[PDB]
Amino acid sequence: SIVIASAARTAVGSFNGAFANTPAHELGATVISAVLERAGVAAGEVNEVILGQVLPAGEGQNPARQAAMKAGVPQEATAWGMNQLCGSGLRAVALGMQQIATGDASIIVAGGMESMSMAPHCAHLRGGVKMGDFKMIDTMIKDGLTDAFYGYHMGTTAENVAKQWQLSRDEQDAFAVASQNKAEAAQKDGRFKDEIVPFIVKGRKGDITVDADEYIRHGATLDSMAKLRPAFDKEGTVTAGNASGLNDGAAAALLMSEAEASRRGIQPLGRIVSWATVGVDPKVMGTGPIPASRKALERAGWKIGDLDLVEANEAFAAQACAVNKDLGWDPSIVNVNGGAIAIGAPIGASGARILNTLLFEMKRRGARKGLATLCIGGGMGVAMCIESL
Amino acid sequence: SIVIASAARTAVGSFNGAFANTPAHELGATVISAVLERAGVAAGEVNEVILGQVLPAGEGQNPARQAAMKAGVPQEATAWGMNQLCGSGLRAVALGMQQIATGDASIIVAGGMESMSMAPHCAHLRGGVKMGDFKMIDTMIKDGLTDAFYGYHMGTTAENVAKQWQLSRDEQDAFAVASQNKAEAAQKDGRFKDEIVPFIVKGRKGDITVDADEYIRHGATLDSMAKLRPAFDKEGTVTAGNASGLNDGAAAALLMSEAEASRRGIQPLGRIVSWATVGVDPKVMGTGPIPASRKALERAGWKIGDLDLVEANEAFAAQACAVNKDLGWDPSIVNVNGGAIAIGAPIGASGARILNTLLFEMKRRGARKGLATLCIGGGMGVAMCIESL
Amino acid sequence: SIVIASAARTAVGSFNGAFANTPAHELGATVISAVLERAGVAAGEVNEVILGQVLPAGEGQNPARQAAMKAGVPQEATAWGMNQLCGSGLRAVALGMQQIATGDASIIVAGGMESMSMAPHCAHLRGGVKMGDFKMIDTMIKDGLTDAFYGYHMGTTAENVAKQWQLSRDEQDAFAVASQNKAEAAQKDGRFKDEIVPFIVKGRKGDITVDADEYIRHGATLDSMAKLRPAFDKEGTVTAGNASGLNDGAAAALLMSEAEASRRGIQPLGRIVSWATVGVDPKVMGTGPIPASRKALERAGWKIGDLDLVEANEAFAAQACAVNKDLGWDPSIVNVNGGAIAIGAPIGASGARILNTLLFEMKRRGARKGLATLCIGGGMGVAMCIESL
Amino acid sequence: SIVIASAARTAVGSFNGAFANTPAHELGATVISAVLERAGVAAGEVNEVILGQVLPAGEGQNPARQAAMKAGVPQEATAWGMNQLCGSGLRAVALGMQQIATGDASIIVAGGMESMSMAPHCAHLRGGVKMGDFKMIDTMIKDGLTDAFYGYHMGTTAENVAKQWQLSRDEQDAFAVASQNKAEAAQKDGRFKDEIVPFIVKGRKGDITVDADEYIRHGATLDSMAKLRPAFDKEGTVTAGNASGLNDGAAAALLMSEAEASRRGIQPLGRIVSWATVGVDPKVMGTGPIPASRKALERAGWKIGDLDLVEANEAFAAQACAVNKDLGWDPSIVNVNGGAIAIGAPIGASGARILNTLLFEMKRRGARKGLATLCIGGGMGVAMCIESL
C-alpha cells in the first residue's frame, strides 16, 4: 500500500573524477532535497532518512544523519545507514516501505550514497608493530570488493560464473559494448535528464555543475574492448571493459502511503508491490538476482512474462548474461538505457540508482509492471516489483 | 505478535583487553549460535541476520554475513549490517521484528556487535597529499564518538546536559559509584550468568574462555572517583569515571511470531509490544531517551508508572540522571544490575546488550512490563517496550 | 694542489613534474656518468663519491652509494652523503678537495642530488597509538623547510630579512621578475646546454628525454608578479613568485690534483685555493652568504674585487636583495643566467647546481676567479675559492 | 698532527628503552658539551660540529645543528650531518681532523648520534595511492639495515661470510658469549664510567638518570646462546645472540691541532696517525674492515704486530671472526671490554662509540698504537689508528 512519490539521483561520477573530493553525505543531501522538491513535500514533514552506504570510514558519525540535516530535515526526525553491499540502495527502499507498512512512520526518504573515491586506507595500530613494514588496507577493496570467505575479488566470482555458464569472452564483450551503446544513446536523447538532479561541486577555483553521467564512454568499439587484458585471471575473460566501474553517486526515493499520496494530490512514480532478498553461494554471488527475482515475482503474484521493463544490475557482463539466460526474460526490456558497465556502480547507491532509472523509464514509456534487481557480495540477491498507478 | 524467543550476549571486554585482537564478527557468531541453542532452533531455519555495527572498517565485506556464515546459518539466508550509532543493537531488533510483521521472514536473529579495540586508523590517500602534514584518523573517535555537526566528542554533549539540568560533579559521581556497586553485586550474585554466553579466545599458547564482564570495577570508591580530572573540559564535570567506557562485545535476540513460538513449544523471553525512535538537538543527544521512551509508551498504551523494570543506557552519568529526572520513573527499577558506566558500551552492540540484561532480569523477578532505551550521537533516541508472556 | 676537471648536472624538474617518480640516486647516477668520461678517468679510478642529500628517507641504504654503483663506479670504491641543507651541494665539492688535499684520495666525484618530489610523509609508530589521531608529517617540510628553533618556514625568515632590510613588495618582485627574464633568456640562447646532461625518465609505455629546466616561466612580467598573494605572512611581502620553488635534480663535479692530471694530460676546469662557511642567527638565515663570502676571500689572499664571476642562491628575493645590498661585488655579474627563483631549488643539489654554471662559465668566458654562495637553514652560509688556469 | 683533546659518549640504550622517546640530537647535545667541559674549552671556541646520523627522518632541519645549539654552541659556529652507514661516527672523526689539517678550522667536535628507536615509518603519498593496499616502511630497516642492491638485511650478508669462511654455529656463539662475558666484567669494574657522560631523561612523571649500558646481559653462557633459532634462514646460523642489537646513543670527541692543545695545556686522549676507507663485495659488507684496517696499517707505517689495542665492531659474529682470522692482529687485545653485540651499535654513533672505548682504555692500561675498525653497509670499510705519546 506504499508508493514512491518521487525519486532522484546524482549523475554518477568516475573514480577520482567529478566527485573525487565530495563526501557521500553531500551527494546524499542533494538527492534528499530533490525528492522533496519533486514531490511537493517539505523537509519538515520527513520522519526518517535511510541510506545504504558501504564505505563510510572517516566520514564522521552516521553520514545518513549528516545528509538529512544538511538537506534541512528537522532534528526531530531520525536517520540511519545500512549495508547489504551492492543491494544496499534498493534494500533501503524496502526497509523504508516497511516503516510505513508497520505504521511507525508516514514519510520516509530512502536510498543509498557512496563515495568510492573518498574511501580511505586503514590499519589497526592500537596493538603495535615495533619494527618492519605493515599493510595499509584500501577499505574500498577490502570492505567493498573482496569476498570475506574466499579472499578473492568480486571479479573472481564473475569468472566462476563465466566458467559455470560457459560464457565466452566474445559474448561478454558484446554485452558490454551493447550496454555502452544503449547508455550513450539514452544520454544523447536526454533520457537521464528526468532522473538526474544536478550537483554543484563547490571549489575555490570555481563552482562546477555536474549533471551528466561521466563514466559513459562515447563511441565504444568492440575492437578496443577485445584488446583488453583479463583483470582477475591470467587466463580469464573478465576485463576492466566488461566489468562495472568504481564510482561515486547517490540516489533516493520519497515514500509514503498510497492514501497519503492521494490526499496530497501527488501522482506517484509507482506502487511497491513486492520485494525479496535470498542468499546464494558466495563463489557465484552474481547469480543472486535469479532466486531474488523469482521470489519477488512470486510474492507479487506475477509471471516473468508479465514484466514490461527490467533493471537488472550489471556488476559484470558474465553474471548479467547468466541472470538473463536463467530468468529468460526478453533481453530487449532489460536495461533499455544501458547498465552499470556503462553508467558506473557507486556500491551503496547502486540499487537506488537502477530504481531511479526504472521508475523514470516506466513513466516515459507507460510501462505498467517493472522489476529492479541486484547481486550482492557474499552471495545474495535483492529484487523489487513496481507497478504504475 | 512478535516475540523474543531467546537472547544471549558475550561478556563485555575492556578496551584492548580480553577481545583486543578479536574481530566483531567472531563475537557475533558466538551469540548467533547461542540464541539458536537457547531456543532449540536450528541454524538452517534462520532467514536473516541483522547486526548493528558502527565501526566495521577493515573487517571485510558485510561482517553481519561473516558472523552468520561462521555460525552455520545457511548460504540461502541473508544478512546485513546497520548503523544508528549507540541505538544500533536495539534498532536492529525492531527492524527484525518488522521483517516478521510484514510477512517477509519467519525467523530473524537481530542485535549488534562491536570491536572498538579493532577499529583502525585511516586516511584518504587517493588524490595524493601534494605537500604539508595530514592526520591518520582514529575511526573509533571520528566515526563513533565525535559529533559531525559541532565537531566535539560525545563527552562535550554530556557537559551540555550537565549545564542545562544543573547536574553537579558530586551528583554524577554518586550515580557512577552506584552503577559500579550494583554491577559488582549483580556479577558476584550470578545475575549475568544467564545472559552471558562464554567466548573462547583462540591463542597460540592457550585458548582462554571469557565469561565475565571484565570492565566492572570491584570496590569502586567515591574518593578515587572524586579525584579524577574532567576528560573533556578544563572546567568540566564529566570524567573517565562517570562516563561509559570503550568496549568490545556482541549481543543478540532470536525473533519469531508468537504463533511460531507456540508451535515450537518455546517459552519466549517476551512480546515486543512497541518501539520508537525520535530526534533531539545534537548538542544534547543524551536526552534522546526522553522523547523516544515517551513515544514507545504511547504506542504501547502504557503509562510511565506501568513499567516494572527499565534499562536506560548510561553513556554518561550526566545524561542518565537527566533522563531519570525528566521521565521521573522510580530509579529503583532502572538499571537494577548496573549500567554501561560499570559494564561498558561496545557501541553497536550496546542496545542489544541492555536488552539482554532487561529480558533476563524480567524473567528472574517476574516483571511483566519492561522498557529499554538508548541515546544516539547526532541527536536521537530509541526505545522498546516488552511484556512478559 | 687541487682542480675540478669536469662538471655536469641534471635539468631541474618542477615539483611532482618530470622527475616526480625518479629517485634521487638515479639522477645522481646520470650526473656521475656525465662528469666521469669528461676527463679521461674511467669510473674504476674513482676513490669516493660525496653527494649532498637532505631527504634520504625511504630511498634505501646510503643513497650516495646507490647512485655510484649504478653510475658504474666499482665496488672497491666508496661513497657517502652529507647534509648542510641548501649548502650541502657545495660543501660536498669542498669536502672533496680536502680528501685530495690531505693526500688520502686522488679522484673524487662530488656534488648534490634531491627529489623533493619523492620525499615521503612519516610518523613514529613503534608505540602503537592507543587512541586518537596522529600526524603524518611531510618530511620535505619538516626536515627540509622548517626552522628547528622557531618552528616556522624558511619563508618566515625571509620576512625577517625583508622587515630588516626594508625590502618593499616592489623590490622583491623586481628582483624576482628579473630572474625569470634572465633565466628565460639564457635558456632560449641555449646557455644551459653545455652544463645540462640529458636524463632519460624510463617509462612502461615509452621513455621521455628531459634536457630542459621545466621550472622557468616564459618571462614573468612585473605585472603578473604583483598579482600573487603573501605566502607566509598575512600582511607580508614574500610570495610564490619572488620565492624559491620546490624542485628535483642533481649536479656534481670530478675533482683531482695538478701533477697527477699532468701525468694523464688532463686539462682542469678550475683550481681550488680555499673555501669557507659561517653561521648567523637562524631567524635570519638568509644573511648566511655574507660572512661566508667574506671569509673565503681572506684565505685566498684575494680582495672582494679580484673575483670575476658570482652565483648567489636566490632562495628568496628578499634574502637575495640583501645579500647583494651588502657584499658589494659587481651586482650585474651576479647570476649571469639566473639562480633559483626561476630555475628551481632541489635542496641538497642546489650548491653543486649553482656551481656547475660557475665552474663551466669560468672556463667558457675565461676568468681568473669566480664564486658561488648559498644561504643555509639554521642560520648559515657557505662558499669556495676557484681559479681557472 | 691533530689530536683528540677530549672524548665523551652517552650510555648506549636498548631498542625502545632508556631513550625510547628521546631524540638523537638531545643525545648529541650532552655529548659535545661533555667533551667541551672535559677539555676545558668554551663552546664559543667551537669551529664546527660534524655528527654522523643515518635515521634523522622527522627530527627537523639538520639535527647536527640542533645538537650544537642545545649544547650552547654559538650561532656563529658551523655544523652538518653526514652518512656512511655503520662508519658514520668514525668517518666523521677524520672529516673532523680534515677540517683542521687544511687549516679551515682549529676546533671541531666530531662524532655520531642515533636514535634507532625514534626512526619513524613512512611512505611516498605525494602522488597518491590510487587503489589497493600499500606499505608504510620503517626507515631503520629500509634505510639503515637493508641492502639497496640485493634487497636483503645485514643479517643475511653476515650469513654470507659465515659459510664463506666455514663459520659454524659454535664458532659464532663463542664470540658472542665471550664478548657478553667481557662486557659484564668491564661493567662491574667501571671502565665505562670515564667515557660515559650521564644523560638525564626528562620524565614529567619520574625523572631518571641513565648512566649505564642496558644492552649488556648478566651471566651470558654458551648454553643460552646455543638454544636460539636462526633468524635470517630456517637452517641459518645468525641469531639474535651472535648479532648486534638495535640501539640508541651518541658519541663524540674534541679535535684540535696538537699545537693548539699545547697552548691550552690539555692532555689529549690520543693522536690520529692514520685513517682510511675502501669498498668490499657488498654481499660481504662485513669484509669491510679487512682491507680497511690494512690501509690504516700501511698509511701509518705500522705492521699489524705494531698494534696494542683494537676496536672492531661486532655487528655480527660472522664478520668479526674473519676480521681476526684473516687479518692478523692477536685476538687477545681486541675489544677486551666487549663489543657491540653486548654494548650496542646505534648506527650513526657506533663509530664514535668504539673510539671512545678505544681512547679511555689505551689510557687506562697504557697502549701506544691502537686501531679502530668498522664494517659498512654497501660493502665499504673505515679505520683509524690512534697513538698517544
Ligand SMILES: CC(C)(COP(=O)(O)OP(=O)(O)OC[C@H]1O[C@@H](n2cnc3c(N)ncnc32)[C@H](O)[C@@H]1OP(=O)(O)O)[C@@H](O)C(=O)NCCC(=O)NCCS
Ligand atoms: C575492474 C576494475 C578492477 C578495473 O580497474 P583498473 O584496474 O584501474 O582498470 P582501469 O579502469 O584503469 O582500466 C584499464 C584500462 O582499460 C581501459 N578500458 C576500460 N574499459 C574500456 C572499454 N570499454 N574500451 C576500451 N578501453 C577500456 C581504460 O581506458 C584503461 O586504459 P588505460 O590503462 O590507458 O588508462 C575495477 O573497475 C573494478 O574493480 N570494478 C569492479 C566493480 C565491482 O566489483 N562492483 C561490485 C561487484 S558486486
Ligand SMILES: CC(C)(COP(=O)(O)OP(=O)(O)OC[C@H]1O[C@@H](n2cnc3c(N)ncnc32)[C@H](O)[C@@H]1OP(=O)(O)O)[C@@H](O)C(=O)NCCC(=O)NCCS
Ligand atoms: C571517557 C574516556 C575518554 C576515558 O578515556 P581515558 O581516560 O583516555 O581512558 P580511561 O577512562 O580508561 O582512563 C581514565 C583514568 O581514570 C581512572 N579511572 C577510571 N574510572 C575510575 C573509577 N571509577 N575510579 C577510579 N579511577 C578511575 C583510570 O584508572 C585511568 O587512570 P590513569 O590515567 O591514572 O591510569 C573514554 O572512556 C570515552 O571516550 N568514553 C566515551 C563514551 C561515550 O562517549 N559514549 C557516547 C554516547 S552516544
Ligand SMILES: [Cl-]
Ligand atoms: Cl545489583
Ligand SMILES: [Cl-]
Ligand atoms: Cl618514517
Ligand SMILES: [Cl-]
Ligand atoms: Cl652505501
Ligand code: NA
Ligand atoms: Na660527478
Ligand code: NA
Ligand atoms: Na631526495
Ligand code: NA
Ligand atoms: Na671480516
